[PDB]
């Protein structure tokens, strides 16, 4: 996207979101990142929404095919699951490459740095979902390490009701439950996150209260499923 203006790439990313053209959206935001400037709060959201939708469709397809493959256990189901899996890993590697070159190293504010490290944890988590044994462990630790650094910063620098802090804790708890085989850690983190946000709600405006309580309900939904 080297010949397109940064502002035009951002404008077209917003258009693609409205048209539910998420592959286009991700390509526009990739081009915007590669212009080399830091991203605004809104721009970080556009980057995240685009790739979350792209990889979300790939993950859903991978699970359908993996289930068919398991039930069957010719080469076609395995071959096609491998194709989808390779395309998913390519998208994850692309996002991780953007974070590493050079979004994270240039992110100095708590809001931007925690946001990018949460992303890094998420896309290693998606790699971990399809990994089998070999570097499954190293991928899992890469996800853990990214989430952990984001957690440490968010606890130092953000209020307990901050939506990025809350969503980070939500996803790290899903990591514990689904990836790390640590359901007790998952439940403990979700509970402590919810209770500390509850106690800080009195400080919020009506609009911030709605933002925070929305994500708190997601934590509650998981606790209800897990206990």
């Amino acid at each position: 996207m080297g010949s397109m203006e940064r502002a035009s790439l951002i404008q077209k990313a917003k258009l693609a979101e409205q048209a539910e053209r998420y592959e286009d959206m991700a390509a526009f935001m990739k081009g915007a990142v590669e212009k080399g400037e830091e991203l605004s709060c809104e721009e970080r959201n556009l980057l995240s929404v685009a790739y979350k939708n792209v990889v979300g469709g790939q993950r859903a397809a991978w699970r359908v095919l993996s289930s068919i493959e398991q039930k069957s256990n010719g080469p076609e189901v395995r071959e096609y699951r491998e194709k989808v899996e390779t395309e998913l890993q390519g998208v994850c590697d692309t996002v991780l490459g953007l974070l590493d070159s050079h979004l994270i190293k240039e992110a100095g504010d708590a809001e931007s740095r925690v946001f990018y490290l949460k992303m890094k944890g998420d896309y290693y988590r998606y790699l971990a979902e399809v990994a089998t044994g070999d570097d499954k462990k190293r991928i899992i630790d890469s996800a853990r390490s990214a989430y952990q650094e984001a957690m440490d910063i968010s606890k130092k620098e953000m209020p307990p009701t901050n939506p990025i802090r809350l969503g980070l804790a939500l996803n790290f708890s899903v990591f514990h439950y689904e990836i790390a085989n640590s359901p007790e850690e998952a439940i403990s983190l979700a509970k402590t996150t919810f209770d500390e946000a509850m106690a800080d709600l009195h400080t919020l405006s009506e609009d911030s209260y709605k933002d925070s309580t929305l994500i708190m309900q997601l934590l509650r939904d998981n606790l209800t499923l897990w206990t």
């Binding site: 929404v49 979350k52 939500l170 998981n222």
Partner: peptide
């Protein structure tokens, strides 16, 4: 288990 839906913004 639901992660952040994060599909809309």
């Amino acid at each position: 288990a639901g992660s952040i839906p994060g599909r809309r913004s």
